[PDB]
Design an enzyme around this catalytic site. Structure first.
Site, PDB file in Angstrom:
ATOM      1  N   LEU A  17      62.465  28.012  63.126  1.00  0.00           N
ATOM      2  CA  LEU A  17      61.245  26.787  63.427  1.00  0.00           C
ATOM      3  C   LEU A  17      60.150  27.533  63.146  1.00  0.00           C
ATOM      4  O   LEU A  17      58.821  26.600  62.589  1.00  0.00           O
ATOM      5  CB  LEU A  17      61.804  25.586  64.855  1.00  0.00           C
ATOM      6  CG  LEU A  17      62.701  24.838  63.703  1.00  0.00           C
ATOM      7  CD1 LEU A  17      62.939  23.632  65.203  1.00  0.00           C
ATOM      8  CD2 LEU A  17      62.949  24.241  62.558  1.00  0.00           C
ATOM      9  N   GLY A  18      59.680  28.599  63.846  1.00  0.00           N
ATOM     10  CA  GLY A  18      59.131  29.368  63.977  1.00  0.00           C
ATOM     11  C   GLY A  18      58.862  30.170  64.799  1.00  0.00           C
ATOM     12  O   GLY A  18      60.262  30.621  66.057  1.00  0.00           O
ATOM     13  N   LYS A  24      61.071  32.877  69.908  1.00  0.00           N
ATOM     14  CA  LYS A  24      61.422  32.064  68.285  1.00  0.00           C
ATOM     15  C   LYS A  24      61.748  30.946  68.852  1.00  0.00           C
ATOM     16  O   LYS A  24      62.566  30.644  69.424  1.00  0.00           O
ATOM     17  CB  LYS A  24      62.177  32.779  67.567  1.00  0.00           C
ATOM     18  CG  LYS A  24      63.664  33.617  68.491  1.00  0.00           C
ATOM     19  CD  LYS A  24      64.171  34.179  66.608  1.00  0.00           C
ATOM     20  CE  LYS A  24      64.056  33.287  65.107  1.00  0.00           C
ATOM     21  NZ  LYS A  24      64.719  34.187  64.876  1.00  0.00           N
ATOM     22  N   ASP A 131      46.894  28.211  74.217  1.00  0.00           N
ATOM     23  CA  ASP A 131      47.271  28.658  73.167  1.00  0.00           C
ATOM     24  C   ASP A 131      47.323  27.345  71.875  1.00  0.00           C
ATOM     25  O   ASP A 131      48.063  27.154  71.703  1.00  0.00           O
ATOM     26  CB  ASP A 131      48.837  28.712  72.786  1.00  0.00           C
ATOM     27  CG  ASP A 131      49.240  29.490  71.873  1.00  0.00           C
ATOM     28  OD1 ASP A 131      48.303  30.284  71.129  1.00  0.00           O
ATOM     29  OD2 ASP A 131      50.688  29.648  71.937  1.00  0.00           O
TER      30      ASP A 131
HETATM   31  O1  LIG Z   1      60.830  20.699  66.540  1.00  0.00           O
HETATM   32  C1  LIG Z   1      60.395  21.043  67.105  1.00  0.00           C
HETATM   33  N1  LIG Z   1      60.557  20.553  68.498  1.00  0.00           N
HETATM   34  C2  LIG Z   1      59.765  22.006  69.454  1.00  0.00           C
HETATM   35  C3  LIG Z   1      59.307  23.208  69.243  1.00  0.00           C
HETATM   36  C4  LIG Z   1      59.043  23.494  67.444  1.00  0.00           C
HETATM   37  C5  LIG Z   1      58.286  24.228  67.627  1.00  0.00           C
HETATM   38  N2  LIG Z   1      57.640  25.627  68.164  1.00  0.00           N
HETATM   39  C6  LIG Z   1      56.570  26.741  67.836  1.00  0.00           C
HETATM   40  C7  LIG Z   1      55.774  25.963  67.609  1.00  0.00           C
HETATM   41  C8  LIG Z   1      54.809  27.693  67.166  1.00  0.00           C
HETATM   42  C9  LIG Z   1      55.118  28.763  68.197  1.00  0.00           C
HETATM   43  C10 LIG Z   1      56.253  28.867  67.990  1.00  0.00           C
HETATM   44  C11 LIG Z   1      57.059  27.540  68.743  1.00  0.00           C
HETATM   45  N3  LIG Z   1      58.017  24.704  66.200  1.00  0.00           N
HETATM   46  C12 LIG Z   1      58.322  23.757  65.569  1.00  0.00           C
HETATM   47  N4  LIG Z   1      59.476  22.848  65.196  1.00  0.00           N
HETATM   48  C13 LIG Z   1      59.660  22.187  66.807  1.00  0.00           C
END
Ligand SMILES: O=c1[nH]ccc2c(NC3CCCCC3)ncnc12
Length: 282
Positions: A17-18, A24, A131
């Protein structure tokens, strides 16, 4: 017996996701029954030391309760993982480019109000976020966003006005107020500065070619390596700011400019931003 305890053996990785720099977040299914009907959750873990940092982040998130802050769901355990609700729409970085036609100025301002309310609650728990960026704001729906990451959040001491930063190697410098860039001091008013930059991102629908880094690297020069921050601080001293995004009414641009007063104590507050936005919405 414990619903905030997720057993590793049932936690199935689906996709990424990121990424931060030392952490991560991945989409997983928690599927104790084994028929792929379990709930989908977001799982933050470390990259193979910062264990203490994740643990501190867990204890912070676990005790925040606000509709504009992403929900803590539990932990998966020396090593540990943070388990949060999954928001399929992703962050504003992903969402805005794909939903421009759906998200008009009114809706954008509603997002901005919600972010200010999440940040204001956070400040009231004596935390500085450090952030705040469109990439860390998650979309719950067309009508709701939530602040979604707290990897750099820090408590400010009682009877102190800031947290002094030591590790700054991987700072988001194009979102940072001067006091952070020059003295590594972080006030609630530094999050306000960051909100100003996030608001600009919101108004440009997170188009990469209008990103704060892109525009700032146009102003000062893209090829200064180690001198980049010095040249950024000079720009801000000289009173240069990000320009008004296209289609942004002046009255909204002035609110944004108030987030960008050089001196912390002369910046607007989250409560004042909320009032200014709510007045433009009525
Ligand atoms: O659905 C989600 N739930 C929680 C975090 C998250 C996320 N967090 C990332 C944001 C950018 C920094 C790395 C973590 N990114 C995408 N979806 C989600």
């Amino acid at each position: 017996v414990d619903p905030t305890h997720f057993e590793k053996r049932f936690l199935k990785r689906i996709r990424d996701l990121g990424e931060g720099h030392f952490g991560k977040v991945e989409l997983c299914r928690y599927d104790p029954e084994g028929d792929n009907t379990g709930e989908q959750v977001a799982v933050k873990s470390l990259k193979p030391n910062h264990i203490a940092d994740l643990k501190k982040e867990i204890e912070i998130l676990r005790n925040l309760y606000h509709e504009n802050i992403v929900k803590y769901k539990g932990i998966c355990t020396n090593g540990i993982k943070l388990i949060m609700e999954f928001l399929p729409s992703g962050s504003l970085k992903e969402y805005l480019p794909k939903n421009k036609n759906k998200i008009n100025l009114k809706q954008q301002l509603k997002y901005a109000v919600q972010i200010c309310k999440g940040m204001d609650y956070l400040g009231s728990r004596q935390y500085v976020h450090r952030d705040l960026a469109a990439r860390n704001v998650l979309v719950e729906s067309e009508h709701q966003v939530k602040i979604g990451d707290f990897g750099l959040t820090k408590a400010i001491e009682t009877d102190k006005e800031y947290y002094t930063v030591k590790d700054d190697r991987d700072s988001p410098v194009f979102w940072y107020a001067p006091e952070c860039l020059m003295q590594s001091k972080f006030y609630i008013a530094s999050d306000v500065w960051s909100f100003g930059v996030t608001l600009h991102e919101l108004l440009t629908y997170c188009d990469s070619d209008s990103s704060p880094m892109a525009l700032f690297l146009k102003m000062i020069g893209p090829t200064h390596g180690q001198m980049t921050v010095t040249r950024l601080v000079n720009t801000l001293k000289e009173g240069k700011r990000l320009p008004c995004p296209p289609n942004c009414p002046d009255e909204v641009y002035q609110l944004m400019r108030k987030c960008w007063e050089f001196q912390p104590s002369n910046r607007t507050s989250f409560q004042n931003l909320i009032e200014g936005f709510e007045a433009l919405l009525k």
